[PDB]
């Protein structure tokens, strides 16, 4: 005769640029894309903070700049482009200034627990990045299909 | 009291890449855009003519190639791109081998009646174009808004 | 006087983010002909379209319990004043957007 | 006395598309032709033609 068979599959753990736990976090609205496009799991620099109006003009991280926060994942604000989710010019952003988020990584080795995070020129985590941050790792280290992700603990500037 | 007013405005003569008159004309189907996009008011080139099936591979004019026909305006086959009417890669094209048509122009002086038509590298009519064509002018010379149009009589190759 | 001097419509539903409107045009000509002409002019047409977007605003305010009790016992509530300020801020921000615009938001 | 004329073209696919979307093209083309005739008559009345005397 025949022997019946059963299969089992486990879902992934996380997707790029999404929150990790329900710990204390502080997301910031009232942020505008001054120029260009911002990926969901990437660092963000502040070009200028308005005095009277109060909006903060943000931009993608570049060389010789201090990171401020990381964009997060939302199904309403984000625009569908480049086979992913991005924030377009002249639109609001949800930037996380504190908490734990799943970032994008160009690294190939698992990190430690309480070491400082280093970012490269385009705002993605790298083992030997030139840009130094005050954030620390959190322990999470997984990947989604062909995309590598890492968990990072952010602190307020 | 007041004096009534009445105004008067005349329509434009023609649009780029449209059949000028009802004289003897021939439009050839079974032509597929091998590569790139083709503007409506521009010439084409024959990359290859299949020996068994019958389809002719058409492409935009390049340096040192003989023109074969001019695309024709249609509200169904064409696809709107760059705020213009265009033919995309794949699909079918409508190129006329004989007749009269309005064509895109770059020259600034009105041409004579029975003179040969010269084309540039990109397939648009020009007074001093390098490419020499057996087609002759028809006398039509108009301008739609900011687009210059010229009427050209085509002959079968 | 932004809403007073300019018309107000109600087409868009709350959930939309964009809208579109279109226009059309035509060209043509005519000529004097004779018998056995075999040559006549032609006509055509065209059209275009455009787009737009939508935004969101918000603010907030705070109050404590002792302030509420003091307001109830003196005939001078503070919650009403704070809510009036909150609504006025929205109205003035809409007016600012209408008559001056914001460069970063395009 | 004199005489005037013009014409227009259309295919089957355009007709079917117009019937299936509620934006007929034949009506627009006919209106364009009639307007061209009226405007040419006005031009003859108010400006005249030199070659035709």
């Amino acid at each position: 005769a025949q022997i019946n068979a059963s299969y089992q599959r486990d879902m992934a753990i996380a997707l790029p640029g999404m929150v990790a736990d329900t710990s204390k976090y502080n997301i910031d609205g009232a942020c505008v894309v001054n120029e260009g496009d911002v990926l969901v799991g990437a660092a963000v620099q502040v070009v200028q903070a308005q005095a009277v109006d109060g909006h903060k003009l943000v931009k993608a991280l570049t060389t010789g700049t201090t990171p401020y926060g990381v964009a997060i994942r939302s199904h309403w604000q984000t625009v569908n482009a480049q086979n992913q989710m991005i924030y377009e010019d002249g639109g609001a952003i949800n930037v996380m200034t504190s908490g734990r988020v799943w970032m994008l990584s160009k690294s190939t080795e698992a990190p430690t627990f309480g070491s400082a995070v280093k970012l490269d020129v385009d705002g993605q985590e790298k083992s030997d990045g030139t840009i130094e941050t005050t954030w620390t790792y959190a322990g999470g280290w997984t990947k989604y299909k062909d995309i590598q992700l890492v968990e990072v603990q952010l602190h307020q500037l | 009291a007041q004096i009534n007013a009445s105004y008067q405005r005349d329509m434009a003569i023609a649009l780029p890449g449209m059949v000028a008159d009802t004289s003897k004309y021939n439009i050839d189907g079974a032509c597929v855009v091998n590569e790139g996009d083709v503007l409506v008011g521009a010439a084409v080139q024959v990359v290859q003519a299949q020996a068994v099936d019958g389809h002719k591979l058409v492409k935009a004019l390049t340096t040192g190639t003989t023109p074969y026909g001019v695309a024709i305006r249609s509200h169904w086959q064409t696809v709107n791109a760059q705020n213009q009417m265009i033919y995309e890669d794949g699909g079918a094209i409508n190129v006329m081998t004989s007749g009269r048509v309005w064509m895109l122009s770059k020259s600034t002086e009105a041409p004579t009646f029975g003179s040969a038509v010269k084309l540039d590298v990109d397939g648009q009519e020009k007074s001093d174009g390098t490419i020499e064509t057996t087609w002759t002018y028809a006398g039509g010379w108009t301008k739609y808004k900011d687009i210059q149009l010229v009427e050209v009589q085509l002959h079968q190759l | 006087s932004a809403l007073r001097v300019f018309p107000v419509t109600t087409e868009l539903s709350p959930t939309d983010k964009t809208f579109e409107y279109m226009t059309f045009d035509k060209v043509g000509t005519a000529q004097i002909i004779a018998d056995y002409t075999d040559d006549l002019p032609l006509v055509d047409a065209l059209g275009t379209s455009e787009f737009g977007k939508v935004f969101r605003l918000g603010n907030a305010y705070l109050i404590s319990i002792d302030e509420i009790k003091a307001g109830q016992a003196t005939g001078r509530p503070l919650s009403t004043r704070k809510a009036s300020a909150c609504q006025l801020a929205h109205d003035q921000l809409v007016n600012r957007l209408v008559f001056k615009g914001s460069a970063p938001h395009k | 006395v004199f005489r005037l004329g013009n014409a227009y073209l259309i295919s089957i696919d355009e007709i079917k598309a117009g019937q299936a979307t509620g934006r007929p093209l034949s009506t627009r083309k006919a209106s364009a032709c009639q307007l061209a005739h009226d405007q040419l008559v006005n031009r003859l009345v108010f400006k005249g033609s030199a070659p035709h005397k």
Binding site: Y144 | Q8 | - | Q39
Partner: peptide, 28 residues
């Protein structure tokens, strides 16, 4: 290069206004 897009498309939140504008050409 995997697809990590959202759930809703751009045409699900979009409105086409009923009115259309047609230019006029006076006869005379």
């Amino acid at each position: 290069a995997a697809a990590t897009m959202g759930i809703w498309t751009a045409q699900e939140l979009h409105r086409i206004k009923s009115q259309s504008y047609e230019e006029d050409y006076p006869v005379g």
